[PDB]
Each structure stands twice: as structure tokens, then as C-alpha cells.
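DATA SHEET
Item: assembly model
Revision: 1
Owner: S.N.
Input lines:
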Amino acid sequence: NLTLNGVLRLVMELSGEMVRKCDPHIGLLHRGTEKLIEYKTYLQALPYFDRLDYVSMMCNEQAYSLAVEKLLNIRPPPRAQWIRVLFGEITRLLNHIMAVTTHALDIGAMTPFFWMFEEREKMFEFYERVSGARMHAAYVRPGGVHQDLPLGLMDDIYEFSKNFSLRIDELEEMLTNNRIWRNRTVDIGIVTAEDALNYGFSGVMLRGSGIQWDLRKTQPYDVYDQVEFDVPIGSRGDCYDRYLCRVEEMRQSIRIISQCLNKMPPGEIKVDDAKVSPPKRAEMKTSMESLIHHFKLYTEGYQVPPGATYTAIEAPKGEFGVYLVSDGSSRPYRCKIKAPGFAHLAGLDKMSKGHMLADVVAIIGTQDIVFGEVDR
Amino acid sequence: ASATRFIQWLRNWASGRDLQAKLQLRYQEISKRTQPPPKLPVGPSHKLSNNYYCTRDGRREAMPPSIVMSSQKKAVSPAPPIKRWELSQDEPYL
Amino acid sequence: QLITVDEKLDITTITGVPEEHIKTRKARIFVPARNNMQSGVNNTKKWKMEFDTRERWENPLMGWASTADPLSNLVLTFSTKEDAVAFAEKNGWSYDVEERKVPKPKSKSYGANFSWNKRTRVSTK
Amino acid sequence: GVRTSPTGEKVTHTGQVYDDGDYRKVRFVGRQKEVNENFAIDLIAEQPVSQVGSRVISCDGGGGALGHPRVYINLDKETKTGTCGYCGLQFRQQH
Amino acid sequence: LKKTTGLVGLAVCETPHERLKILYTKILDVLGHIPKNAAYRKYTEQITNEKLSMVKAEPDVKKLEERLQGGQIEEVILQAENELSLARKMIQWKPWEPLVEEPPASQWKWPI
Amino acid sequence: SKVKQDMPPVGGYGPIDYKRNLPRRGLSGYSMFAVGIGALLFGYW
Amino acid sequence: TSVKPIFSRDMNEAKRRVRELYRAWYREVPNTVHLFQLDISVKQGRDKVREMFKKNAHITDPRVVDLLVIKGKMELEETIKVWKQRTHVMRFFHETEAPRPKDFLSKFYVGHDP
Amino acid sequence: TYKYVNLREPSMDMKSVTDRAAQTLLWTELIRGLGMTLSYLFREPATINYPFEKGPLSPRFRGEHALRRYPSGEERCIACKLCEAVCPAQAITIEAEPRADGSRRTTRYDIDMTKCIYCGFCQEACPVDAIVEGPNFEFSTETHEELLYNKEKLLNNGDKWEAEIAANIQADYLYR
Amino acid sequence: LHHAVIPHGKGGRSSVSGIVATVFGATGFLGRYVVNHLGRMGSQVIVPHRCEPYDTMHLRPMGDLGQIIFMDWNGRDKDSIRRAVEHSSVVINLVGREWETQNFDFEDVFVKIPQAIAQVSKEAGVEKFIHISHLNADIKSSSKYLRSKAVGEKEVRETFPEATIIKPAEIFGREDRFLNYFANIKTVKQPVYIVDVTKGIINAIKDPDARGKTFAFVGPSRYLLFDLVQYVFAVAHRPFTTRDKVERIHTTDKILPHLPGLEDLGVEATPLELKAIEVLRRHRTQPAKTIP
Amino acid sequence: GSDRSRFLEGKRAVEDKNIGPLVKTIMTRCIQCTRCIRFASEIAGVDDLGTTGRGNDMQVGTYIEKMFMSELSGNIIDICPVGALTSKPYAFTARPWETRKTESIDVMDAVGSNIVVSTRTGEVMRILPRMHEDINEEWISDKTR
Amino acid sequence: RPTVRPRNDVAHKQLSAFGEYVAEILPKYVQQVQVSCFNELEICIHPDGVIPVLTFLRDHSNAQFKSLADLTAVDIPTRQNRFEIVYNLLSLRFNSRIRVKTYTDELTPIESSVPVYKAANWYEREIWDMFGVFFANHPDLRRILTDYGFEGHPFRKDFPLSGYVELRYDDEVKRVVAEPVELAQEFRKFDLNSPWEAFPAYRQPP
Ligand SMILES: CCCCCCCCCCCCCCCCCC(=O)OC[C@H](COP(=O)(O)OCCN)OC(=O)CCCCCCCCCCCCCCCCC
Ligand SMILES: NC(=O)C1=CN([C@@H]2O[C@H](COP(=O)(O)OP(=O)(O)OC[C@H]3O[C@@H](n4cnc5c(N)ncnc54)[C@H](OP(=O)(O)O)[C@@H]3O)[C@@H](O)[C@H]2O)C=CC1
Ligand code: SF4
Ligand code: SF4
Ligand code: SF4
Ligand code: SF4
Ligand SMILES: [K+]
Ligand SMILES: [Zn+2]
């Protein structure tokens, strides 16, 4: 048995070509985020969530914002909810492009990465236009969103959306029916429905095995109950089916984005409660109450009533949640981050039994692992 | 958009698609980089009367947890069983 | 099954704290004084544990305040003085406890502002 | 209002300058000491006093919502002018 | 008989009705070793008997699934096996007994 | 003046495709084999 | 004073685990010096191991001893399996830390720390 | 609602079996993949000619920080320290005292640009639009020390970039 | 003490040692150790260099932000020396070459350049001056290297009378041209470890009684050159250069009892046997007999 | 309080009074609570502070130009609930959230007044009283302050 | 009321009823059951009940909490048992969530729940690493996040934010070395809490 030895350290035992054991050594990107958050106000801690699954930035923001809003006992205004679903699905497109094409590039198919990253670049423009940052927008906040959409943005999202399904088609032409791609993915990393549940899998790791579960359907948040879309379900629980689910989820994301653009309502973008959301700058500069509340929100921050909540969303990589403990002050007492990739990577050894070394690359790819969220 | 007719035919035939209808590169259809100024609306708390904060104060309606048992009949489930999902009628099978 | 252990609870050897920052420190257990700039008393409810202040020096490059004390910012919160004392004991920190200061009840009377023959009569309102 | 010291080092608008025996000025050898030459204290002093016909004037720094929080300045004293606490503009009640 | 359950690793059952009668009978047999006044026995007998009645009173599998509300009939069989496994463990744990130990006075107080 | 913020056009946006579109191309297996074998027989001759 | 044990039910059983751990560490040092290409002698490696055990000699709680052994075993696993790198093994020897003064006068001269 | 991605039964009629045999032997689906990459060979590339051409940005873009002035030249910053308080990275260090004319002004305003996360919270928190993130993103340096900005550097950035900064604020302040 | 140079901290990277040092020859063998020990305790180090900045890159991680400052200089340009030293409290001269070049002979590196550094340092008011000479420096040596070291050693003592002069034996270490020299191939040698020499230099900066003195840094053991070379081959697991270099290697290491040594600066000499493998391990593809 | 304003008029503005080198007055901030007046008359035994005028234009001050120099004068800074009365030496130097509080003792006399030493980044920024009912109840002398 | 989060009384009753259900069936271990105002059910149990209570919730037909969403710890130094162990479970069958909480101190092991949920494996390693809680009968208990040889448990409230040692490359020894931590700029502690009570509903009796 020959023993071999973000970034990952894999310690593997091989008997010839077959993997006999796979022991991931992580922590190479552990940055004590959860401890750092204890020294921040609730607003100050928000940018940390952009830097967890740093491919799905506003979905992490949404998860944290929903948790804080739950403890605050407030709700964001309807237009903020529609924006949040709109950019949640744009973010799912960003993640699935990264997941699928880097999964392809890791096993030799390097060209789809280039075609689809020109699409990622255009979606980075949508983030930059609403928030001024291409990635770590810090746009979705407890109470709603920071700023309203600039005029002319939705028109450009429509133009991008109108053409995207053709880009997905070109990706499928390269991979879906390719016998080499199928040879690398079909019957690779088979996981049973009961094993997936007990190992704590979520998202596509569950649906690839036929489990009919999606938090946007079963436990909806924001305005997801107001949009129509289908949940892709796998039949073999292998890498190829999880690849197909991700491709089909991109198509359903465009379907949801189309409804968000048409059903976007008017109104304010953050909760009209200046004890939570800061007032408009013009109000801050004219009204005594508004200036006081601006001063206090940006120094002490709002206090959150004491309590604890586990809050989860259907992030692009699976169930992403926070167990957020408030002690009544303006700084969280404890923030545990549930990263879907933590449980998924914990199951690499189980998934890789009876496979060869080159399949371990495929299995890591089908799990969709970003070590920002695994290590936190 | 500048491709000659022959090149358009060639890359259309090679891909099997009408690529010219859905070009990846953006041209004049994008929004102008200068826009008229907005005038954003105000929320529902922007009123001069009938607007006391104690009637719209979410944080102060939060309560400590309800204790149902402390160390100081039909069976139930945590919620009704989940309903079977329905197959899509838009496209049941890929 | 439960075993019987009679020794004092001590965890100094399994907490990973370097020896210098256990034996040479002095924890202060106290209820923070009300900030006299404000009348609110909500920051005087809980017991605190802080450590002895140590050197801060000016960084040559920027003039920032540098430190070598790893405990300079550490402040723990406790519901009672007993809890704070217990925590210090098992961690091996020597400590001082200051008894809570309570404002004693005053005898207030608006009508005394207008006394007929006492000095409590106010000359202005 | 930038001036040099006896060593020739420019004094900043905050009054900073390394004295003769300070080794730290070695950092500037072969390079330069960044100094902003537009001293705000001198620029504001060049602004004329605004003559107004009321006891109380308001200042928002100009530009409306692009200025500072709007404050009201009392002009009852003739000994001096009323100065905005935010932008430094001065006002005087006429006669 | 359906071609697949749709769940990887969950095989189709050829005779689900007789499999469920055997399991539900086994569960009721094990629950007899639990004290009569333990809530686990009373509740588990109640639900087990409700499911057993539906199994005997409905010969069509898909009509039966609609009544059990447990997903695929193969999922209901697996759940019966899970309950039977649990019931056996409950006899060793005896959770119907009084609370082993009270917590310290402020163990569950929050905020501090 | 009138409220002005980003909104969809009156009547909404035009339809957006999303469904997989991989068109059918090529000849049947029979014809493809027939061309291949016909090329072989011409080459032999 | 009744508590749940970790492994040992009293100090005699805890001390047996300590001696087994010491034997495992003592025998592993020659391999560690070779595999990690250390510039210390085997004697130095074993002297360091003995030092680390000795500083914990005063413990009388079998639970604390149990945890010390648990952590000692994990440290040995990281070394034997070469999860550690050379830098991790050499961190026991503080080769770049100039000695801190110990007597009162030397500490008085350099700073305020006790 | 759900759909199946891969639940289909291949037809076993001889015409279909031979279709799959031709695909296996003639590599037809591999040929189809060649066509897609060929069609890209003749597409115009998406590359832009940097640094002669630049990627588009919006007025909201968060770039290099700068301290601003009023039109008269007086500093906008009044040493309120709201930026320093909100800064998620503690990248801001401020000291202040009464100026010679009695004005409330800073004597130190440092931003450690290698602590900063370019989040823009400081410019949201500022009540007088004094500290902003400007449009410049091309300020990489050769040494770490060059990215430790003091007040002189930040004021110089404001004087250097104000022409652009003011126009960007003009285009976005009604969204704030 | 000027307020800026009062020591602060706990002697680590972010501390303030109060030393402001100009190190000439910092980009060489001895310089990299000297600069490291200065930056370890938070000293301000000025590094005048003649070479490409690319060749000074290994020095940058040795100090906290701002503590290592680089300057151009020319050995023949006194104005460039004045720029480098006029803010320092100590000047350390490690300039030297083991060979001569068309542009610099031994009289330049070991006499003219050290004398110019010493003179400008004297004029600029530098309090302390540390000059590295050689144990075997001698105006009657067969080595032009060692004759120049004697002439320059005298001119520094005359020009900057308070200079601390250090006379090391052959220095061995990872980057040495001694143990490595043998591995790349009558006389008694007393080689000294590089870290010992570095610590001696650092302690000379602090010790006030070191001013105006001359030290000889030697190792703990004396070896016959044959027995030493034999040991090197054994350690390197190997079966067992200019004319001036050969003369130096064959010059017996002087025994100067009257001079203070490493023990007079609080430094314990490191035996060759402890550190030889560290230097010679990379050369791989019975302790040497010592004179009593 | 509420979270917004419905006040659509212009605001009062009040001229400042000079009462010495220790207490800065920005009297537009005054909320007319009369704590300073009562403290001065009752605790310090000095009847130099009062209210002049009537109604919305009622103003707190000395009427005439006059310094409020008492060995206890600095305490009106602490009791003033707003920034109407502030410490002149302390002005603009720090914000409360950033200071570290060291509870200590005053040595400017033999009363042993209990105090808090506000420090920031290794520098003493101000001195505040610390309540000790049996000593300094919650006051300190101007020298201690 | 547009800005106030709406209540859901139907879910509050269901969860309350299931809370009593669980406590009636496992009286040996359940110490407290509560439902939060945003409708989350928490079972507080004696640490002995971990395996029986989790097994019941996974396997019982009216529970079927087949998924372990998260397992973490909270350090509360004022408590005799400073570590609170939190299990967040998900039931797909009943579309419901539940939280189970127990407690331990520095020297008291908790039974590993890997036998109930294989997902628990790495979570318990993380709790061991970050909090120093020992889990008994774990198939492979060792650090997972911290550096090799790291001393202490960083997520404890009394562990300093910046730790005790920092790394750098040292040229003399030609390797990365660890040294006591010194900071060019100390982290600036902020005292942000208002001295005025915010939430009367949570006021603690004096
Ligand atoms: C009168 C009777 C006359 C008698 C003679 C009649 C003879 C005619 C009938 C014979 C026709 C046979 C064609 C021979 C070509 C080889 C066929 C072949 O080997 O295909 C099978 C192979 C693997 O296929 P696979 O999907 O993995 O499944 C099979 C194993 N289970 O598939 C592969 O090899 C895949 C190759 C992977 C590499 C792909 C990269 C190449 C793609 C572009 C190639 C373009 C073609 C180049 C043309 C040549 C240029 C000079
Ligand atoms: N190493 C030994 O065995 C012993 C050495 N010494 C003395 O110690 C000192 C340093 O030893 P070592 O560090 O080994 O010598 P190195 O040759 O390793 O380094 C010599 C230094 O001198 C600089 N230098 C050489 N010539 C010139 C010049 N013409 N102008 C400017 N700078 C120059 C080099 O800079 P660049 O990189 O630009 O060439 C280099 O930094 C020397 O004086 C040497 O004689 C004494 C006894 C024993
Ligand atoms: S952009 Fe964010 S991190 Fe940077 S200085 Fe401003 S508030 Fe701090
Ligand atoms: S930049 Fe703005 S927020 Fe920061 S101190 Fe100055 S005025 Fe206050
Ligand atoms: S204490 Fe302050 S607010 Fe009250 S009356 Fe005096 S100056 Fe006005
Ligand atoms: S801080 Fe208080 S006193 Fe000062 S302006 Fe604001 S509300 Fe008025
Ligand atoms: K005041
Ligand atoms: Zn103004």
C-alpha cells in the first residue's frame, strides 16, 4: 500500500490504482472568522460572509441577513426581497459556472472555462453596478439591501439573460454527450439516498441521489414562494447526474431571473425603521432624529434581542446556515457557520472507495468545494 | 457583428446554431452609461401622523422563549407530513 | 460510573497558556463603575474580569500603539462574583476582588424645595 | 502655509517635523516627505464674511444634501462673527 | 410493480403488504416488553396500529401510499425497520425512568 | 415630482429561453455506414 | 465529588498510561531525528521529551492526566505519520528566541514586566 | 415541482441500435464537439487592449481612498471618528485636537491599505462626505510601507482625484 | 538618549531596540546574519549596497515594516557614505572580497574603503564603529589578503580610535567559503561558527566596555588542517580558488592570548562537531582529532 | 424616542457664554434641564448660574459676563446630560467608545477620591469621578479633574 | 404592519405540542423544552441522554430527523459547565427542524454521536479543536482546523483574539519559526454597549 501526501492536503493509501483510504487535511485556510465576528457589530460582521463561499457572495449575505432579521423581529420591504432573490439567482449562475467549468478544467476540458468566464465577467459588472465591488459587494444587509438598483440595470440584466441559455447549450455540446466526459463521471462517486442523509449532505449532493428536497421549495424565504421553477433530480447518484442537475439548475435560475425582472415592485429597499436601517443621507443631514440614529447605527450598531437561531438557505453549494447567538447587545455572542462543503468533504473517503486516483479529482469536483467556507 | 457573410455562415454551420442572433459581445443594446437622476420613493413610516414608533417597533415585540416543560393523548409529529412533489409539466424529463 | 476526585479543580496545564501569562498576571474581578457622563446604569449589572495593564509603545513607522501583551484586550463577563472567582481559580490566575458598590437609597422630596424654615429651600427653579 | 525647519524638512499642516537629532528622518533619504501644500486653515481664512440681515442664519455647507448637516448660527454678538462648526464659513449680522 | 423507487440504494419491494404486516407485528411484539405506562409504548403502539390497519384495509399499493403519507412504500418499510431497531434499544435505555440528574441552577439561563 | 426608479417596461420584457436546445443533426446510422462502406469499396477498386 | 472519568479511574491507572506514552515517545525520537533530518542529537530529542513530561509532574487529577496523555498521543501521531513538518518538530526548541532575563535586576533593567 | 435530468430508456429497435453503433465507431458526437470549438475560432474574441482600453466601471466603484474638501478648500473631515468606529478591519487610525483657529480637525488620519477590505463602510458612515473611496484602482506599489497612508497622502489623493470624485458623487448621491 | 531611541517592547520583531545601524557589506555571508540579528530585536538597519536590488531581497523579511532601509553607495564616493551614516548610532563594516578584481584589489577593500568609512563616520559624529579584520592579519604574511588586513586594521584604529576591531578566525556556516571550500575540492586551524561571530558583533554594539578594544573570535578547538579536511570528507560522505586563498588556508591560526575573545562578550563558542553536518548535509549525494 | 422627525420649521440658535478656561459652553445644545444651576447652588454653594428670559427663549447662564470658577466647577460637565457643557482641555481629542477605563485613586489631596483614568493607545486622555458614597460621592475637585 | 416580522401561531402550537411529546417519552434525560418567538424548538437534555435522545429523534416514526444540519459548541465561562453542545437536526419527512442542547466542562467527556449521524465525525473534531471538549469513542479524534502542534483552543472566550505565537521565516535557521506575538498596532478594544436598557421584555429580576 503506497501512501501519498483554496488548497488541500490529501493523505491517501493506494493499492495499485485503487484508492483504499482518503484522509483530507484541511485548515490551510482557517482564519478564525467565527472568533473575529465576536468582536464586530452585526453590520461589521457582514463582510466576513462574502469571504466564506467566496463564489456565492450575496447568497452568504442573504443567509446572515435573514438570521439577523429573524432575531430582530423585522422584515425587509418587498422590493428588497425581490432584489435579493434576483441577485441570489445571478449568484447561483456565478457559482454553477465556476463549479462546472473548473470541474471540467481539472480533468482536461479547459475550453468551456474560458467561454463561461466571459459570462461571469458580465455578471461581475452587475455586482459592481449595484454595490461598487465586483465580488465582495456587502450589498445584502439585515433590513434589506444597501442601495436601490441604478437606472438601466434591469434592462442590461434582461439583455444578458436573453442570450445565456445558448451559452449553456454550447457547454452541453462540449460535455453532456461526450463519451470521454461520461467515462470520467458516470458511475463515479455513487452515494445512496440514506447514506447522503446520514452523512449530512445537502443540495445537489442529495438531489443527485433522487431525494426530493430543496429549501427554496420546502422552507421558502424572501419571495421564493412567488416564483415558479423546477427542481432537477438525479437517478443514479453519481458525478454525471450531479453535473446534469447543476446544468439544469442554471437553466432554472434564468427562469427565475426572468420572473424577478418582470415582477419587480416599486418602493423602498431597506426596512423603514431607523433603529435598524440607517436613514437616507439627505435625512441624516436635515433631521435631528435621523442624525442621532445614523450616528448610533454606525458606532454602537443596533442591539439584537437575546436569543439563538439556526437559519439556513439553499445556497448554490447546498444548505448554508448560521447558528447565531445574541446576548442582547450590538455584537453577536456566537456565530457558528454551517458550510455545506464541510460535510461534503467529510464524505470524500466514503465516496472514493473502490475508485482510482484520477477519480478523486472528479469526486472533489462534483462536491463543489471552496475552502473559504470549509475552513472559515 | 463585423464578420463577413461567409464567416457567419461557416461558424453558424459548425455550431449548428444561429449565433448572430445571440452574440456574446455587447454592442449598442446596452444601457447608456449616463442616466437621468432617480427620485426614489419613501417607505411606509414616512408619515406626519398616526405613526408612533411604539406601534411599529418590531424589536420590542420579541419575547423570551416559551417554556413548555421545565425541571423546576394522540401522538404528534413536529409538523404535518410533507406533501409529495408533483412532476413538472413544463418539461418532466430532459 | 462516577469516580471520586477530591483535588482542587486546576486546568492550567491543559489550557495551552504560556507560563508567563498565568503566574505573573493579576486578574481584577469587579463590577464596572457607572460612566459618570451618563445616568444609565445598564453597564453596571454584570461582573467583569480584566488583567493588569502592560506596556504600550509607539511603532517607529507610523506612531501606532504597539503591544506585546496577548491579554491586553481580554475581558470576561460573569453573573456573580463567585463565578468570576471560580473561573480565575481553575485557570491559576491570582486575582483581587472588589465588592460591588451600590448607590444607597436617597430621601427625595419635591416639597422640601419650598421649606418654611429649613435651608433646603431653593432660591431658583 | 508650508515652511521648512532648520534642517530644511518641510513642516506639515499638523505641525509635524523631525527634529535635528531624530534618526527617523533617514526614511526620507533618497526619497521625499509627502506634504500637502493646501493648508485648509489658510484657505478658509481667505473666505469673506457673509453679511446677513437676521439674528440666526443656517449653514449646510453648500450643495444641499452634498454639504454637511444643517446648523443654525446665532449672530447676536457684534464682538465677533458666527462661525459654522462644520465648514468654517463666517457670518455677520448687518448693522 | 414499479421499475424503481427513485432513490439510489432503495430497492423495489415485490410484496410490500406482507413485509409491512411482518414488521408492524414485530414492533408490537417488542413493545410488549416495555412497561404499560411508558409514553413510548403507548404512542408507538398507537401509530403502529394505525398504520397496520391501513395496510390490511387497502390492497392497492399506490392507494396505500396515499394513505400512509410516508413517501414510497419502500420508504415506509425502511421506517418500520427503523422503529423496530429503536424499540429494541429503548428497552436497554429505559428512558421512561425519572430524570437522572437536575442541571445546575443557571445551566439554561440566557442571557447571563 | 414623480417617483423614478428602475422598473421593468410597461408590459414587461420579452420572453427568455432557458430550456435545453441541442438540435438533431447528421444522418441515420444506416446511411453513415453506407457512405463509409461505399468509400471503402471505391478505394479498393 | 463524583465525576465522570475519561479513561483512568484513579491516579495509579493514569500513571500507567503516562509511562506507556513516555515509552512510545522515547522510542520514536531516533526515527524522528532521522526522518525529519534534524540537526539535534537523539539525546537532545529525548532530553526535550523528558522535560515536557517533567513540567506536568505535580498533577494529581486523573482526569487532567488523562487529557495530557490524550494530547500527548495526538502529538505523537502527528510526528510519527509526518503530518508535522520540520518546522513543527523544531518548535519545541525555541532556537531563535533570545533568552529572557530571569533575575530581578536584569528584568528591572530592560522593562516593567514582573 | 421537479424534473428528471437522466431518466430515459434507450430504444432497442434495430434502427436505433445501429445509430448508437455508428456513433461508437464513427465518433460522431466527438466530431460534433469539434464543430463547436471550430465555430469559436472564427468568432471575434472578447479580449480588450489593456491599458489602452479599460473594463467598464460604474460611479459606485470602490477604489483608492481620498480625503475631500469644501469648495473653499477647508477640509470636510471634522474628526468625528464614525469611519474609524465602523471600519470592519480597524484600518483607520485617527487623532484630533482643536486647530489654531479653534476648528475641530484631525492631526492623524491613517488608513492601513493592507488591512482595509475596500468595503466602503467608512464613506457610508461619514456625515460630511469627507472620506471616500475614489475611482483609482491602479496604485500597486513596490514596498509594503507605501500602502500605509497618512493624512498628507490621503489629502493629496483628494486634491489629485477630486475632479472625478465629485462627478461620481453627483451621479450617485440621489441613490444614497 | 533621544526619545526616539529609548528601547521599548520585549525584544521582538515589533520592539524598538534603540539601535540605528549602518551595515556596509550587508549583502554577503556575514552581513545576512548580522542584519537578521539586528532586525530580530527591532533595530533600524541601513543597508548600503553596491549590487542589484534583486540581490538584497533576502534581507527584506528580516525586519518589521520600515526597519530595513536600502541605499545606493560607491566605495570610492565619500558623499554616498555620508548619506548612509549621518543618522546612525553605530557603523558596522563587513566589506571584503576573498579575491581581487580588475576594479578592486585587496588594498581597496581592506584599506582605502574601511578608512573612508571610518573617517566619514568620525566626521558625522557616529558614536560606535565595529570593524572586522582577521585573526591572521600580518604585514609579513605571504598572503596579500592578510597583509592588507593588517594595514587597514591599523588605519582604522588611527582614524576612529574608539573603534571596536574584531579579528575572526576562519568562519564556517551554511554559506561559508571554508567547509564548503573543502567539500568542493603542517597547518593548525581554529575555525569559529558564524552565529558566534554574529552574537559577538551584536554584544559589542551593546557593551560599552568594548569601545576601543580589539577582539579575536576563535572556535573552541584547534585542528590540524589535514585532520579537519579528513573530517569534512567523512561528514560529507565522500571518499577521501586563487593562489592567495591557498596561502590563507595554510596559514596557522595565531594564538593571541592578550586579546579578549568571545567569552568576554558573553558568547560560548560552538564546537565544529555540532554544526558541521548542518553545513555539509547538502554535499551528501568520527570527530576530528584536536590539538591539546 | 421615535426614529424620525416631523419638525418642518427652523431651529433656535443661542449665543455662547464664556465661564472660564475649564468649561466650554455650546448653549444651543442645552435642553434647559437646570442640573447645572441646582448643582452650583446646592453642591458648590455658588448662586452664579440661573435662567434669564422666558419661554422658548429662556437661557441658562450668568446674565453678566462672569467666570464660574469653583474648586468643584468641573463637575457640571458630568451632570450636564448633553454637550452644552464640555471639558475645554479634553475637547475633540477622543470618543468614548475607544477609551480604556482604569479605575484608580486620586492623589492630588488626602481625600482619596475614587476616579477613572481614561486612556487611549497608551495615553491618558481625561479623569472622571468614580462613585464612592463614603468619600467623593460622585464628584471630584477641579485639580483632580 | 410592513416592518414587523409576522408571527406564525400554527407553527408555534405544533412545535410546542411536539416538545411535550418528546419530553413525555424521554423523561430520563429531558431537562427543559422551549419554543422561541420565531418558532424554533429546543430540547435541553442531560449529557447522558445524547445517544438515546438523538437516536429517538432520528429513528422514531413521528420524528425522522434524518439529517444532522450542524453540531457546534458555545463557551459561557460564568457557568459551572461552560460548554453548551448544540445539535441542529432536520426532518425531511415532516419539513421541520429541532435543536438539542446539552452541556459539559473541560474534564467531562461527551459521548460521540458518530453512531447516530456519520456527519458528526468532523463536527466533533472541530469542537475538540476549537473548544477542547473531548468526545468519547470517536473513531479518530484529533485537530482539524488549527496548525499542527497548536496549543490551546482558540474559540474559548478566554483565548486571546491574536493568540500567543506568530510565525515568520528566519534566515539563520532556514525555516519558519514561531515566536511570541507582538503587534505593530494593538487591536483597539471598543466599549460599545449603551448604559440604557434596550429590551424590557428580557429584564432579569434583581
Ligand atoms: C466489404 C466489407 C469491407 C470490410 C472492411 C469494413 C470496415 C469498415 C467498418 C469498420 C469501421 C470501424 C471504425 C474504426 C475506428 C475505431 C473505432 C473505435 O475504436 O471506437 C471505439 C472507441 C471507444 O468507444 P467507447 O465509447 O469507449 O465504447 C467502446 C468500448 N466499450 O472510440 C474511440 O476510439 C474514441 C477516440 C477518442 C479520441 C477522440 C479524439 C479524436 C476525435 C476527432 C478524430 C477525427 C478523426 C480523424 C480522422 C483521421 C485523420 C487522418
Ligand atoms: N568569512 C570569513 O571566513 C571571514 C571574513 N572576514 C571578513 O568579514 C567581512 C565579511 O566576511 P564575508 O561576509 O564572508 O565577505 P563576503 O564576501 O561574503 O561579503 C562581502 C561584502 O563586501 C561587499 N563588497 C565587496 N567588495 C566591495 C566593493 N568593492 N565595494 C562595495 N562593497 C563591496 C559585498 O557586496 P557585493 O555583494 O556587492 O559584492 C559583500 O556584501 C569581510 O571583511 C571579510 O574579510 C574576516 C575573517 C574571516
Ligand atoms: S473601505 Fe471598509 S475596511 Fe477600508 S477603511 Fe473604509 S470602512 Fe475600513
Ligand atoms: S472622515 Fe468623515 S466619518 Fe471619518 S472622522 Fe472625518 S468626518 Fe468623521
Ligand atoms: S446641565 Fe446642561 S442641559 Fe441642563 S440646564 Fe445646564 S447647560 Fe442646559
Ligand atoms: S451628541 Fe447629544 S448633545 Fe451632542 S449634538 Fe448629539 S444629541 Fe446633542
Ligand atoms: K456634558
Ligand atoms: Zn457650514
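QC remark: The first strand of chain H starts at residue 2 and ends at 4.
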